[PDB]
Amino acid sequence: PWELTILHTNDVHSRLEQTSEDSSKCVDASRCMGGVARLFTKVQQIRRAEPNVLLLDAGDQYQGTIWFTVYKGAEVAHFMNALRYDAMALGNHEFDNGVEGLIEPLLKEAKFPILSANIKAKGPLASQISGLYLPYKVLPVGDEVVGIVGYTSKETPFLSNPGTNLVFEDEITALQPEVDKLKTLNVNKIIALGHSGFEMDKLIAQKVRGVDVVVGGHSNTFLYTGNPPSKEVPAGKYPFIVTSDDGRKVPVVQAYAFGKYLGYLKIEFDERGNVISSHGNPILLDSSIPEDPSIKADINKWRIKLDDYSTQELGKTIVYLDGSSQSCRFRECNMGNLICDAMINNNLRHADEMFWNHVSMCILNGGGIRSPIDERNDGTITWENLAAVLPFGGTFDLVQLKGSTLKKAFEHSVHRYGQSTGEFLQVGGIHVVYDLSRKPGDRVVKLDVLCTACAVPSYDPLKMDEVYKVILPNFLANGGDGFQMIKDELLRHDSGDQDINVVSTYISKMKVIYPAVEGRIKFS
Amino acid sequence: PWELTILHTNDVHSRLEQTSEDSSKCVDASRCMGGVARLFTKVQQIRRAEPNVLLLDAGDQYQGTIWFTVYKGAEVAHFMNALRYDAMALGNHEFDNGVEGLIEPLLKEAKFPILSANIKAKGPLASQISGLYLPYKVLPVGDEVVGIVGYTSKETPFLSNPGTNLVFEDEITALQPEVDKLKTLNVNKIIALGHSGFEMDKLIAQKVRGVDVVVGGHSNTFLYTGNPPSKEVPAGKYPFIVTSDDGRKVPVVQAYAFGKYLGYLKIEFDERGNVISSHGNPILLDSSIPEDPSIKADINKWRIKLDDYSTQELGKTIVYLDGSSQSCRFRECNMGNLICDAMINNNLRHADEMFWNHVSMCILNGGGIRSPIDERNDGTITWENLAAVLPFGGTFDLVQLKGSTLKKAFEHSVHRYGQSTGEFLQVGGIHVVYDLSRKPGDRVVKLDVLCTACAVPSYDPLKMDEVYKVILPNFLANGGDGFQMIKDELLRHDSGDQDINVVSTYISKMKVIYPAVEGRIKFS
Ligand SMILES: Nc1ncnc2c1ncn2[C@@H]1O[C@H](CO)[C@@H](O)[C@H]1O
Ligand SMILES: Nc1ncnc2c1ncn2[C@@H]1O[C@H](CO)[C@@H](O)[C@H]1O
Ligand SMILES: [Ca+2]
Ligand SMILES: [Ca+2]
Ligand SMILES: [Cl-]
Ligand SMILES: [Cl-]
Ligand SMILES: [Zn+2]
Ligand SMILES: [Zn+2]
Numbered sequence A, B: 001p002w003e004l005t006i007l008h009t010n011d012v013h014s015r016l017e018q019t020s021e022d023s024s025k026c027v028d029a030s031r032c033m034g035g036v037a038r039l040f041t042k043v044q045q046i047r048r049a050e051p052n053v054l055l056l057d058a059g060d061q062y063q064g065t066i067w068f069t070v071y072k073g074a075e076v077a078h079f080m081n082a083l084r085y086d087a088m089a090l091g092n093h094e095f096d097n098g099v100e101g102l103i104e105p106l107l108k109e110a111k112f113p114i115l116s117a118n119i120k121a122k123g124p125l126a127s128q129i130s131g132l133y134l135p136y137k138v139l140p141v142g143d144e145v146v147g148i149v150g151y152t153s154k155e156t157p158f159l160s161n162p163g164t165n166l167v168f169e170d171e172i173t174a175l176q177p178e179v180d181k182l183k184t185l186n187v188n189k190i191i192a193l194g195h196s197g198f199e200m201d202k203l204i205a206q207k208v209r210g211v212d213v214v215v216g217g218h219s220n221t222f223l224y225t226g227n228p229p230s231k232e233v234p235a236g237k238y239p240f241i242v243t244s245d246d247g248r249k250v251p252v253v254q255a256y257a258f259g260k261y262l263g264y265l266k267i268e269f270d271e272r273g274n275v276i277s278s279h280g281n282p283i284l285l286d287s288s289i290p291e292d293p294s295i296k297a298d299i300n301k302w303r304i305k306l307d308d309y310s311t312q313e314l315g316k317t318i319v320y321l322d323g324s325s326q327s328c329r330f331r332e333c334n335m336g337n338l339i340c341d342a343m344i345n346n347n348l349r350h351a352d353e354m355f356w357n358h359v360s361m362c363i364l365n366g367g368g369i370r371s372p373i374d375e376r377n378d379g380t381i382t383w384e385n386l387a388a389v390l391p392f393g394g395t396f397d398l399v400q401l402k403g404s405t406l407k408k409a410f411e412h413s414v415h416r417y418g419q420s421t422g423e424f425l426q427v428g429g430i431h432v433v434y435d436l437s438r439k440p441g442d443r444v445v446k447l448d449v450l451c452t453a454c455a456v457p458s459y460d461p462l463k464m465d466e467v468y469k470v471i472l473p474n475f476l477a478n479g480g481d482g483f484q485m486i487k488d489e490l491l492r493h494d495s496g497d498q499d500i501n502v503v504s505t506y507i508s509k510m511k512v513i514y515p516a517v518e519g520r521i522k523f524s
Helices: A036-049 A066-071 A074-083 A100-107 A125-129 A171-184 A198-207 A293-309 A334-349 A383-389 A403-413 A484-489 A499-510 B036-049 B066-071 B074-083 B100-107 B125-129 B171-184 B198-207 B293-309 B334-349 B383-389 B403-413 B484-489 B499-510
Strands: A002-009 A053-057 A087-089 A119-121 A136-141 A144-152 A166-168 A190-195 A213-215 A240-243 A249-253 A261-269 A275-280 A313-317 A362-365 A380-382 A395-402 A425-428 A430-434 A444-451 A458-461 A467-473 A492-498 A521-523 B002-009 B053-057 B087-089 B119-121 B136-141 B144-152 B166-168 B190-195 B213-215 B240-243 B249-253 B261-269 B275-280 B313-317 B362-365 B380-382 B395-402 B425-428 B430-434 B444-451 B458-461 B467-473 B492-498 B521-523
Touching (some): A036 A074, A087 A144, A087 A190, A100 A125, A198 A213, A334 A492, A334 A499, A395 A403, A395 A484, A403 A425, A403 A444, A425 A430, B002 B036, B002 B213, B036 B293, B066 B293, B119 B125, B136 B171, B171 B190, B334 B425, B334 B499, B380 B383, B395 B403, B425 B430
Parallel strands (some): B002 B053
Antiparallel strands (some): A240 A249, A261 A275, A313 A380, A395 A467, A444 A458, B136 B144, B362 B425, B430 B444, B444 B458
């Protein structure tokens, strides 16, 4: 039998540097994980041990940290080139800066093929982008050939900014004729590599005849066999074996997100390209694997521009930005409003999945806000100013909560009001009124939440049994500040973008901000 | 004596096409005024009649209409070249797209000198922008030479986006050594051409010794001798003669704004370059002057790209945008909120003077909002969609009003509530509560307005004798919809940017909008 090792990443989301275990900034330098330098170490070791190896990425390298804000994809081409990826599928985030932001930094500089069979170009763009991404690629591997076909979420127009000259076709209908072309070319080992989410990956394994293995992304799905090595709870075994409509066992794999795991799948094929066994598990890239010094030296070199960005003017304020603890731990503060508005706006512009692309409610612990920003002089705000406001190195995560849970979180927000501690919440898309003369646990007297999805979009009373989607710091999603009910009762929690980056890009895009105290939080 | 005719424009604000008498879109094609084609006719006629003629622009050609949104300054270089301007001073709006947006479209393409003596470049920019604008230029005119020195408002960093590598120095201190250089060169006829406002222009005429004539802008100042030909009321005679500290009569001139007038000043000089007389008046460019057909043919040709922009996707909405009359003439509607938020945000980003750069209150007649925009499909908003919402061809103007005036405007808003007419106001930066059970004229029971300039920026009760600055349609500033108290009582009214353009660029910059009904207007 001929054995192929597939190494794969997906939804790296600009985590070029090593991170903490939850994908936020690495605070404890000896428990960090992921990053491209550590990835390279582990990939090089397997390439030395195994004769036939492919390294694939299933999309969403773009977006998430200062690396993408400053380098805009040039860092993705440079470091994926340095790692010698064999192919990549386009994900939705690859369109976040429009087709122009995809063609220049990435499609023109990458030294490997970039694939998607279901994106059709038209008008003027068609001979402009022509051949810059491919529906399939035949790759030699050792003494054999493997074909790779790409696909990208049809939800891309609602998530990103691909423009009106690209059509996203149904994946299975677009994939079948390309796999048929590979079969006509006598390629008998075919990987479908793409970015549509685990549900669609399972449907492709079942329905696209000729596909031997599916390597996917988009849904941040973690699969693992046996006792998992970190906090992620697996959605199924790895590989997740799906039997096809033509009765073959098709391994389906994904490797969570954020470059925290390297997916590692070994497949044995018979002489006719049928899979006769498959086994593996994602490898946790934790600090027991050293960062490769030649990649890390390049990371250090590229970081100099990022460190320089710290003093650059992002925008201006026309108001004093009151991030003092005497304000933000006690009442509505306009710095809290600004940060919640940024959290919302960034996720609406750049959402990771449709499930989250209408989120319009935000809570933020006031103890998370650590400095004011004065408008004298000229009102200039820089990254360095924001880093003093948000110094903890966190992310702004997405959670789905029952109303009863959120009501308990607002009771917790004032249960010991007056003690100057950090759990008092600033909000966006929420109007709350407290009556502090009432018993702890019964101080919320009105709690109305923005409803975006409906007749006349508006604030409506929170309902205990309805479910709501909220953006908030990772620190609160994990139950910090005593918000144990959030951690214990939430229905879904996805990690999101790095925090200072999110606020800096919001100010960059607004240019002039004027947040004000406007009645989001009242006391009666 | 040697006689020089100075023709001059300032604060054209992207009004390349002819306009209505108030600078908004030309609706009645036979009462239109201004535009570059008509300007060219009148300038060519004077060039044929007079031997020594200079055509100067004192700044703020950038910004104001779709022409600048689509062409970003290339239209300014092209048409000022076609008119054969002899020189231009930089104004604040020339920095609205940053130094990069100034260097490429304008400084590199202009065929005339672009001047400013008080802008100093440093760091990397210094040898990059070097020589692309000049502190002075010596120009031959007929058989003599005239020197021109430029200057630009020190308020530019607070109005625009010139970056932190440009320093704006005090104008009189920067101008004096450059005028001294011209004197050393034996130039004895010196025009100071610049963009700092009439107050500063008068101080330059008094204090910069050697300046013969000041040609200014920025403050949209209209000067005229005798009975004025249109609606503008003159601030003084034209020219406005200032005696200098060295006892010379220095004509100071400006020509309003929007290309509506061509300034026309004749100066006689003795052999030593002393002004021995000066006379003139701005010429109203009204429809008695034909549009020049060679310039208009080019305007038509360049318009094709603008007409094409009408179908281009600007951004997306995630909410139904309710611009129906049943909503917007009766209660808060999220289309009204969106348009007021756009009006505010655009003017904060791109304000014409410091006087207006903190405006954070907006009123908008609900009868001005003429269509909803559905989110199906994909939520795409185009210029054409917005043109259906805002079809009247107006501008969003700046007014300063006493509180008592604004309170009367809110009483007018509901004085015959229920009759479905268009005077009901949508708002931004204002919370109003009405009690419709009370007498007409006494229905406003709460009226709180955002105060940006203060301790903890916030909504505070309107005070009858305080003065407030508000952005609103030209149609309301001129007393439309029965708001005669606004027209009759306002303290200052400046025309602003064209309306669909303002909303389109706001959506372009926000990318995804989600306006909602949030309690700006309540009934008790
Ligand atoms: N990782 C973190 N992210 C956000 N806020 C934090 C974090 N750690 C501590 N805080 C805030 O700092 C306060 C203590 O100064 C806490 O009550 C909490 O509100
Ligand atoms: N030039 C204009 N600008 C804005 N709104 C207008 C204009 N002309 C008419 N309207 C609105 O149209 C309504 C009549 O349909 C008027 O009551 C007024 O609210
Ligand atoms: Ca096969
Ligand atoms: Ca002189
Ligand atoms: Cl999925
Ligand atoms: Cl002035
Ligand atoms: Zn994705
Ligand atoms: Zn100006």
